[PDB]
Every structure is written in structure tokens, then in C-alpha cells.
Design a protein around this ligand. Structure first.
Ligand SMILES: C[S@@+](CC[C@H](N)C(=O)[O-])C[C@H]1O[C@@H](n2cnc3c(N)ncnc32)[C@H](O)[C@@H]1O
Ligand SMILES: [Zn+2]
Lengths: 73, 188, 305, 107, 408
């Protein structure tokens, strides 16, 4: 069961897969004309996804509260 | 027991890291709060309309001398009016009764004043904020009596350059709980 | 009108100070000595939750959405803990110990009492010293934010001050009784607990003389008095709400005698004296319809309309 | 408020009639605008109000009712802004600001 | 609201006079909009953030633009709902994000626009009229039963031309009808648009007042007064007659005779709009203005700032004026101060402003069951507001509050 932690590890892994298998297709959404104020969406692969690659600093920090908790009893 | 011992190191040396909250002089607080001891003790551990347009932004707060005192909220210069004294006007026989009637019940503060020798300015129930400043034998304020259009208001100037939140003084000229050494040990 | 439902806790044990239900109506926190028990009333389970306090916990507070529990004890801790996530913030700002606390009715400002004649404020995310309320002459027991809107802060203290402050800037705005002076001869009884009502338009007091009054803060006088036909305790007050006409007030005596007063008229219909007969009572709080109790001995009796 | 006496249309106590005369036969520029004596009479009201506020203010300290010229120098030199405005000036029969250099004061 | 029940003797003002806070926000802003109560200030920031402020401690609670839908370019205008639950945010990243503070970091539904924007205005909490740049109709975007079908409803009849009037740049809804939308063209003319909430619209009112780019149209909250800010130096407040059937007439004209500045934003008073504010455009104009809307005179000036103030907001509960000083970027804020009272030290003091000559009576020489109710909340404050609607409290972030000691 583990019904107090897996709600986080559904939503920590939602960053990996449910955010993953939807927001991976933004990078082939540049691919409509060919392989800048028209279509300025190129820097948000690493500026709006800057927090997405810094989400690993925090999504394991949610995933180590039970590392503090399951050793606490 | 195996649970609580492994939770022991969560509160034996990790209670030595977190409990660093000593910041006072470490007073006698070992008595339990399920006892509810009263301790009714005087211990102090804290650090202790015409003339309206011309006044200063001084506030009242808990005094460094006594119960309540005024705190000058700007660097006042040498001779500027802090506050006009405001209150009642009642003469000497009616204020003779009130001088004892409040202390018959026992308030314990001389909230009168004198303009001329016949009449006083009462400040027990009514008054201004000018009443709140207390006695110190070393002066930082005086109160000259000026006249404004036939009737004499009482106006409290400064003597010296009072600073920001420097607590004002006043001489009364009829113990000294100011804490000052260079003073007479009484009021009189 | 009112009856007894269930009692699950045993009497004897450690120091028990506050019993507190979250305002959702289901999740109860019982302050034991450096411990908090969680009693879910729906399926009748238990849960123990211990916090990083050192000393005997006096303050305990609940979230308006039941997501965080703030406490406070006398080693200058100002502690806000989470329901499962742990210790959140530790403010450590008063130079005196702390008796009781409350919340802003949005949930951002846990208010705070210091016994050295000052009352201060903390923000959760800022964590800094917001405001200073230095207007007091004694150690301060209870500061009750009213239930509906978070505008005014009523203060209770050991000298006799029914004093009402500001939250927006932090100034004095009302005082209903006098202080130690104005008779200066022991005429003013000290105050144990000030409480607001559901609306917040009526204020409730229990004093050291064990006399209960329901203050109208607005006019300046009182409209109710509730006698016991001397206390040495910090006991609590509550206004239980039935669905009918009259919500009864409840406070606790030196011992387990607990009358409830009609407040609309002034008579005394019910009294729960069957329990707590050895046990001297500090704290009471309620739910929509589930009211708990506590004493030095931890008896949590639930009730129902 | 009124119609006659333009000062009363503006709400001043200084005349805007006289100031509009003294901007033409003083020969300051060719064609003085209509808003120009209004703005100038308001400023000369305000600086006269700023002095005579502070003049009778230090008339009260002296305890006298009327203002002598000695009160005007005590209103001007004690105030920094006014002092800057009246830097060059000497107010006739007006004394000085009471100060001693504090090296000369005794031990 | 119980602080104003205890603060004065009973006199409370109808505009703030002094300025007591200043939000130290170093990245600059474009728009400042409060909540429908005084608690939350939405700040439309310059780079593309939205740094929402709790108006009790001057330090924020959230940032809309973390999870999904952050503005890449600047954010132009914002409004709030009836209860303060949602946010409708118009920006220069060609995106109108309806946010919801139940999930206080993620958008709900966006729209890739054809270009930048000017403003937004909500009628209901979902439907929102946006001003697409260089468009002579207003494609009002509605969140329908499905979120995806943003019906680009063209706010124009199929025959009617505003050829010679330019584009529509302002659209502000009526307060009291909630279905007739007043819009103003880029050249002079003013239309009305009665949306049926089907999609029939009637051009009931058309006119031209003066040839200018209408920067802003506001309506007083009693639906009586309507003020127009052109691209020339005038403010024309008009009176509104809607029973539909609409006609306006000239009430007053407000100008700066001295410097001839442009008025950036204008805003009205609470009940019937008895006071009009404005913020001028040119430098050395350092102050918001006030005007008595009947007499017309410059009655007061909010002399608190040091820069030029761009946008404005007047929430009526806290009586504050929030305004971004455009040069530095900081949000200037005015507030009605309340001075303290020593009259509440004991239950009988009195603060009389003059030495009263109390008459001498004889006494100086001599030696319940009211009705009690506990159930109802309050109904009207001292200001006389729509109070007894317990507002949508924005919940604080109880998803990651434990993290907020470590690394934002
Ligand atoms: C003229 S009233 C002063 C105002 C009063 N302390 C207040 O703030 O409300 C006299 C009071 O000042 C206090 N007082 C008189 N002389 C004092 C002194 N030398 N040092 C400290 N307090 C003094 C006395 O306790 C008396 O109650
Ligand atoms: Zn002394």
C-alpha cells in the first residue's frame, strides 16, 4: 500500500512521465515550418524548462522526507 | 524497545543541535507550567485647536522611567514646542476635592497642573497626550505659559536637542525613580 | 439538547494541557507532555505525533484547513509543524516564554504572546519580526482571533486587561476593564481566558474569580453574567453550538463540576458532572457538534446535541 | 466663489490685478500670459504666509502679540530654506542669531 | 472589517492622503490590480513574472508563472473574478492565461494570439474581453464547458464599419447591466455592444467625441459616470443613461493648463464615483491628482512620490492606491492612516482638543436581558460595502511549504 508516500511518488514521477510524455512533444512543435518575434518559443526549451531541470533539486527533496520519516519509527 | 532507541538518536544528540534557543539571562523557569505558580512579583526583564498645527510627532509607549512615557519620533532641535498641554480648567477649591477623591479610591498620579494660582488643568479623565511625560530632576523640557487670544494655553518646549526615541523629561517644581544618579533622591 | 457520546482516553498519565479539534469537525489534537495524539472520530483510530519541543507544551493551534499544527513552549520556541511533513519554521523571537497563540483567519499569521509585556507577530514565509505590541502590565494568557474575520485581536492577561488591539498596524483600540490600578487595592480580579463568539461581535471571559461574562466590546459594557452557584487555574472556555435556539457556554471549575449556562436567558439547565471527578480541568474546544474536554488527567469526553 | 476681483476667483489674498499691472509696466517681456499673474500671486502669498507663520510663531515664544523686526530675523535665520532664499539680505534693526562658538565657552 | 469599527470617533475619509508602504520590487512592473478584497495585490511585472503580494506584511505568497503558462514577454493587464478566485491575465507573449489559485502555480487554459495585447476585462469570471492589437473588433474569449473552444466572438455587427475609426483598443463592461459592453475606437468613436451571453450583439450606441487614441474608458461603479481618456490632454467624464438604449452627455473636462501632460490612467471612487484620480505622463509630474467630479476643481494631490506613476488601482475596502513608479519600478502605496489613541488605555479617558471650561456642579462636594444572537455574520461595515460574502481566501502553497527553507 504505502498510502502516505506514494501520493508524492505518483507526483514526483508525474514530472518524469506525465509531464514527460506531454511536454516532450513541444520540441517537435518547432518542427512545423522547417527543422524571431514570430515563434520565440526556442529559449523556453531551457528557460521555462530551466525550472524543469532544477525540479530535480526539489522533487527528490520531496522524495527524502520519508527517508527522514521511515527511519523516524 | 527497538523503535524508541532508534528514535532516541533522533532526540538525544539531535535535541542538542536544535535546542540552541538560549538568548536571555536564563531566569528561574524550572517550575512546571502545570503547577501554574502565580509569581505576582514586580520583576522587569525587558530593556527599560489653534496650536495643533505646531506640534511634534512624539508617541507614547511603555516608559523607561515609569508606566507610560512619551517617545520623540524625530530629532527635535533646541527650542521647538513638543506639545501644548490640553485638559480641563477647574479652579482651586474644586480641584482640592479631586486631589484627594482620586486618591481616596487610590489612582495615584498628580494629573493636575497650574496656569495661574487660582486654576488648574486637570488631566485624569480628559486631557492631551502632553500629560504622559514623567518627572526627572534633570530637565529636557520646560513649560512656559503663553497667552493665545485672552486665555493662557500651556506649551511644553524643549531645552536640548532631543533625539529619535529619546525619552523626554520634565521638572515639576512643587522618590526619583528615573534611575539617574545626578539628582535629588526624592521628588521634592 | 445535549448528551454524552463516547470517552476513549484513560484518565491518569502525563501532563495534559490543551485539547484542540481542527475546525473541520473531525481531527483532534491532544497536547500531552511534549506529545500530540491524533484521534480521528470517523472510523475511531488513533495516531501519535511527537514534535521537537523540549518542555511542557502550552500553546497548540490548528490550521483552518487542517494542514499544519503550530505549538509553543517556554524554551522560547515558536514552532509551526506540519501534519505529515515535519517541522516547518522555528521563529525563536520572544525574550519571554509563551502561553497561548492563535491564527490569522487566512492562515498566514500565527499570532504570539510574550510574558514580558509585549506581543509580537510572525509571518510564515518571511519569518521576521513584524510588529510589536508592548501595551501590557502582566503575563498574557490568551489572544483570541475571532472565527469569521481576522480584523481585531483581543488580549487576555494576568492583571485584569480585557484589552483589544490592532492586527493591521498593532495599536491599542479598546480596553474593557481597568488594570491593577484605579482601585489599586486588589479590587480588579485577574483574567484567565478571553474568547470571541462565532460572529466575533460578542466577547467571552472567564476570570480568576471563576465568573463568566459575555462582553459587548462595541458599547463598552457587559450584557451577561454567569456565576458558579476562587480559582487557582488557567482553565478554558467554550461556546458549544447546537442546531436549535440556544448555544450554551461551558468552562471548567477547580474540579470536574461543569455547568453549562443558557446565554439567551440566564438559567442553568444542564451540567456534566458525571466525569472528571478527580481531575482539574484546563482546556475545552469543540467541533460543529463534537466537543472535547481535558484536564491535568487526560480525559477526552465527546458529546452530541 | 465670486466673479469680480480675480484674486477671489483664484482664492488668494494677494491681488492679481496689481501683479498683472506690474508685469507690463515693469517691462519684463512683451506679452504676459493670462495665467502668469495668477501663479505669481499665489507664490507671493505662500512665501508671505511661510514667513508670517514663523514670525508670529517666534512672537509667541517672546510672549508679545505684535511682530517687531527682531522676530523676523529669528524666523528667517532659524529656518534653512528661508535662510537660503534670504542669504544675501540684511533685515534692518533685526539683531543676529544668538550663538557663541563653543570653543569660547568655559570649562 | 472590525478595525474600522474601533479606529475613529466615527469619521473616516473618502480618499487616502498619505503614503505609508512601498513594495521594494526591483524588477519593474506594468499593472497593479488588487483582489476584490484588500488582501492580495496582483502585480503585472515587466520581465514576465507575476509577483502576487499579501497586503499585510509586504512580502509575497505565490508566483503565477512557475508550473505552466509563464509569460515570456511582458504582462500588460489583469483582472480578478467576482470572488477573487481566478485571474485573467493579458500579456505581450501573445497569451491570455486564465489562472486559478486552487492550483496557485499552474495555468488552466491559454490562447496563442496573432500578436501582442493591450488589456483585458472580465464580465463573468470565465468570459474575458481582450484587446488584440491592430484589430477593429474585440475577439472576446470565453471559457466554455470545454476549455479548448475559445470562441473568438467578433465584437462587431456583420454590416457595421468602423473604417475611419481605426481599431478597438479599450473595452470595459458595464457594472449594473453586466451585458452591454462599452468600447472605444482608436480614432474617436465609442460603441456599445449588448452581448446576449447566443452571440447576437447590437450596436446601440455609436458617436465620435474628439479625434484621439482613446487610451482608457472607465465606468463609475454606480453605472452613472463614464470617463474617457484620449490621446490628447483631456478627460471627458460623461453621464450614462442605460435602461439597450444609450446616450451620453458632457459633464466636465479636466486638463493640466500648466504643463499640458497626458493622463495615463484614471480611476473613480467607490459608491457613485464622487472623486476622479489621474496620473500624468511627463517627467517632473510626481503625483496623482484628485478631482471633485461635480464641481471640477483640483481638490487634492497625492504628493508622496519621486517618479512618474504609470498604472493605478483603488480597492475600496482598505482605501489604498497602488501605483508603480515607472522609472525605478517600485510600487508606491497610499493608505488611510489611523493615529493611535490613549483613550483606550483605561475604559474612561477622553481626548479633548481644547482646555474645556467644565461647569461646576453640586456633586463635587458630596461624599440585563437584551436580545442575544450568535449565529449571523456581519452585514454592512462602516464603509457600507458588499460584505457578508466570505471571499475566496487564496490558500498558501501547502504542496511545498516544507521545501521553502531550502532553495526557493
Ligand atoms: C504628573 S503624573 C506623570 C504622568 C504619569 N506618570 C503618566 O504617564 O500617566 C505623576 C506620576 O509620575 C510618577 N513620578 C513622579 N515623580 C517621578 C520620578 N521622579 N520618577 C519616576 N516617576 C515619577 C508618579 O508615580 C506619579 O504617579
Ligand atoms: Zn533621576
Amino acid at each position: 500500500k504505502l498510502s502516505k508516500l506514494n501520493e508524492e511518488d505518483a507526483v514526483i514521477e508525474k514530472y518524469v512521465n506525465w509531464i514527460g510524455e506531454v511536454n516532450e512533444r513541444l520540441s517537435p512543435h518547432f518542427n512545423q515550418p522547417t527543422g524571431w518575434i514570430t515563434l520565440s518559443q526556442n529559449d523556453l526549451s531551457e528557460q521555462k524548462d530551466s525550472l524543469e531541470n532544477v525540479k530535480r533539486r526539489l522533487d527528490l527533496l520531496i522524495s527524502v522526507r520519508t527517508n527522514q520519516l521511515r527511519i523516524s519509527f | 524497545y527497538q523503535q524508541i532507541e532508534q528514535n532516541g538518536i533522533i532526540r538525544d544528540n539531535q535535541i542538542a543541535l536544535n535546542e540552541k534557543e538560549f538568548d536571555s539571562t536564563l531566569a528561574s523557569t524550572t517550575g512546571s507550567f502545570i503547577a501554574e505558580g502565580f509569581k505576582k512579583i514586580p520583576d522587569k526583564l525587558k530593556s527599560s485647536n489653534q496650536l495643533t498645527k505646531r506640534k511634534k510627532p512624539v508617541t507614547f509607549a511603555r516608559s523607561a522611567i515609569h508606566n507610560w512615557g512619551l517617545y520623540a519620533l524625530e530629532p527635535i532641535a533646541a527650542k521647538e514646542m513638543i506639545i501644548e498641554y490640553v485638559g480641563e480648567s477647574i479652579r482651586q477649591p474644586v480641584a482640592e476635592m479631586r486631589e484627594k477623591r482620586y486618591i481616596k479610591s487610590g489612582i495615584g498620579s498628580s494629573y493636575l497642573f497650574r496656569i495661574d494660582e487660582n486654576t488648574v488643568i486637570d488631566a485624569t479623565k480628559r486631557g492631551g497626550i502632553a500629560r504622559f511625560i514623567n518627572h526627572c530632576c534633570e530637565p529636557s523640557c520646560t513649560a512656559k505659559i503663553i497667552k493665545v487670544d485672552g486665555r493662557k494655553r500651556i506649551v511644553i518646549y524643549a531645552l536640548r536637542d532631543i533625539g529619535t526615541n529619546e525619552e523626554l523629561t520634565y521638572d515639576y517644581k512643587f522618590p526619583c525613580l528615573c534611575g539617574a544618579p545626578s539628582c535629588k533622591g526624592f521628588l521634592n | 439538547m445535549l448528551q454524552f457520546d463516547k470517552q476513549v482516553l484513560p484518565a491518569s498519565g502525563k501532563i495534559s494541557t490543551s485539547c484542540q479539534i481542527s475546525p473541520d469537525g473531525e481531527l483532534i489534537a491532544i497536547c500531552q507532555n511534549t506529545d500530540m495524539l491524533v484521534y480521528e472520530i470517523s472510523s475511531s483510530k488513533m495516531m501519535k505525533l511527537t514534535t521537537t519541543h523540549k518542555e511542557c507544551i502550552n500553546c497548540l493551534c490548528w490550521s483552518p484547513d487542517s494542514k499544519c499544527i503550530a505549538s509553543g513552549s517556554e524554551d522560547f520556541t515558536v514552532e509551526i509543524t506540519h501534519i505529515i511533513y515535519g517541522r516547518i519554521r522555528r521563529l525563536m523571537g520572544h525574550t519571554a516564554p509563551v502561553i497561548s497563540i492563535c491564527y490569522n483567519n487566512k492562515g498566514n499569521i500565527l499570532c504570539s504572546s510574550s510574558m514580558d509585556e509585549s506581543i509580537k507577530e510572525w509571518h510564515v514565509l518571511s519569518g521576521t519580526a513584524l510588529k510589536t505590541m508592548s501595551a501590557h502590565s502582566d503575563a498574557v494568557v490568551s489572544i483570541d482571533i475571532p472565527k469569521f474575520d481576522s480584523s481585531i485581536l483581543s488580549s487576555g492577561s494576568y492583571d485584569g486587561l480585557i484589552r483589544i488591539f490592532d492586527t493591521e498596524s498593532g495599536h491599542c483600540l479598546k480596553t474593557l476593564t481597568y488594570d491593577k490600578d484605579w482601585i489599586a487595592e486588589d479590587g480588579v480580579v485577574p483574567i484567565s481566558t478571553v474568547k470571541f463568539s462565532r460572529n466575533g461581535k460578542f466577547l467571552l471571559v472567564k476570570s480568576l474569580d471563576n465568573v463568566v461574562k459575555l462582553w459587548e466590546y462595541t458599547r463598552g459594557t457587559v450584557v451577561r453574567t454567569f456565576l458558579w452557584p476562587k480559582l487557582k487555574y488557567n482553565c478554558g472556555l467554550e461556546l458549544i453550538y447546537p442546531q436549535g435556539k440556544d448555544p450554551l457556554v461551558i468552562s471548567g471549575n477547580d474540579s470536574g463540576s461543569m455547568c453549562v449556562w443558557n446565554v439567551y436567558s440566564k438559567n442553568l439547565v444542564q451540567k456534566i458532572d458525571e466525569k472528571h471527578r478527580n481531575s482539574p480541568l484546563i482546556s475545552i474546544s469543540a467541533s460543529y457538534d463534537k466537543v472535547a474536554t481535558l484536564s491535568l488527567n487526560g480525559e477526552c469526553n465527546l458529546f452530541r446535541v | 466663489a465670486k466673479a469680480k476681483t480675480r484674486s477671489s476667483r483664484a482664492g488668494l489674498q494677494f491681488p492679481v490685478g496689481r501683479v498683472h499691472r506690474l508685469l507690463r509696466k515693469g517691462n519684463y517681456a512683451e506679452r504676459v500670459g493670462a495665467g502668469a499673474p495668477v501663479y505669481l500671486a499665489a507664490v507671493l502669498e505662500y512665501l508671505t504666509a511661510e514667513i508670517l507663520e514663523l514670525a508670529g510663531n517666534a512672537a509667541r515664544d517672546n510672549k508679545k502679540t505684535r511682530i517687531i523686526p527682531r522676530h523676523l530675523q529669528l524666523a528667517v535665520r532659524n529656518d534653512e530654506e528661508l535662510n537660503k532664499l534670504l542669504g544675501r539680505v540684511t533685515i534692518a534693526q533685526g539683531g543676529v542669531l544668538p550663538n557663541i562658538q563653543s570653543v569660547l565657552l568655559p570649562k | 472589517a472590525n478595525l474600522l469599527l474601533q479606529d475613529p470617533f466615527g469619521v473616516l475619509k473618502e480618499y487616502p492622503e498619505k503614503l505609508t508602504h512601498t513594495l521594494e520590487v526591483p524588477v519593474a512592473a506594468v499593472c497593479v490590480k488588487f483582489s476584490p478584497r484588500g488582501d492580495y495585490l496582483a502585480v503585472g511585472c515587466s520581465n514576465g513574472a507575476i509577483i502576487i503580494y499579501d497586503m499585510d506584511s509586504l512580502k509575497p505568497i505565490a508566483m503565477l508563472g512557475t508550473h505552466s503558462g509563464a509569460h515570456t514577454r511582458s504582462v500588460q493587464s489583469v483582472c480578478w473574478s467576482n470572488d477573487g478566485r481566478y485571474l485573467w491575465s493579458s500579456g505581450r507573449d501573445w497569451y491570455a492565461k486564465l489562472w486559478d489559485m486552487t492550483q496557485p502555480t499552474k495555468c488552466f487554459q491559454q490562447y496563442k494570439f496573432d500578436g501582442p495585447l493591450w488589456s483585458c476585462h472580465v464580465v463573468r469570471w470565465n468570459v474575458c474581453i481582450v484587446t488584440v492589437v491592430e484589430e477593429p473588433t474585440a475577439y472576446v474569449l470565453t471559457l466554455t464547458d470545454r476549455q479548448n473552444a475559445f470562441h473568438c466572438f467578433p465584437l462587431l455587427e456583420q454590416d457595421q464599419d468602423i473604417s475611419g475609426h481605426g481599431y478597438t483598443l479599450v473595452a470595459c463592461p458595464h457594472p449594473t447591466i453586466e451585458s452591454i459592453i462599452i468600447t472605444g475606437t482608436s480614432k474617436g468613436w465609442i460603441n456599445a455592444f449588448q452581448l446576449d451571453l447566443e452571440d447576437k450583439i447590437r450596436c446601440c450606441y455609436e458617436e465620435k467625441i474628439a479625434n484621439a487614441n482613446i487610451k482608457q474608458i472607465i465606468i463609475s461603479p454606480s453605472g452613472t459616470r463614464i470617463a474617457i481618456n484620449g490621446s490628447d490632454r483631456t478627460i471627458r467624464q460623461y453621464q450614462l443613461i442605460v435602461e439597450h438604449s444609450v446616450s451620453i452627455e458632457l459633464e466636465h473636462k479636466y486638463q493640466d493648463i500648466i504643463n499640458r501632460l497626458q493622463w495615463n490612467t484614471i480611476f473613480f471612487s467607490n459608491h457613485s464615483g464622487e472623486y476622479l484620480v489621474a496620473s500624468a505622463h511627463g517627467s517632473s509630474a510626481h503625483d496623482l491628482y484628485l478631482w471633485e467630479t461635480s464641481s471640477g476643481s483640483l481638490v487634492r494631490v497625492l504628493e508622496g512620490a519621486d517618479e512618474e506613476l504609470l498604472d493605478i488601482d483603488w480597492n475600496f475596502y482598505s482605501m489604498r492606491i497602488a501605483s508603480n513608479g515607472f522609472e525605478s519600478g517600485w510600487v508606491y502605496m497610499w493608505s488611510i492612516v489611523i493615529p493611535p489613541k490613549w483613550s483606550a488605555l483605561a475604559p474612561d479617558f477622553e481626548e479633548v482638543e481644547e482646555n474645556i471650561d467644565y461647569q461646576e456642579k453640586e456633586n463635587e462636594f458630596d461624599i440585563e436581558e437584551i436580545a442575544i444572537d450568535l449565529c449571523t455574520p456581519e452585514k454592512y461595515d462602516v464603509r457600507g460595502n458588499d460584505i457578508s460574502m466570505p471571499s475566496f481566501v487564496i490558500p498558501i502553497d501547502y504542496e511545498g511549504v516544507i521545501i521553502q527553507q531550502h532553495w526557493a
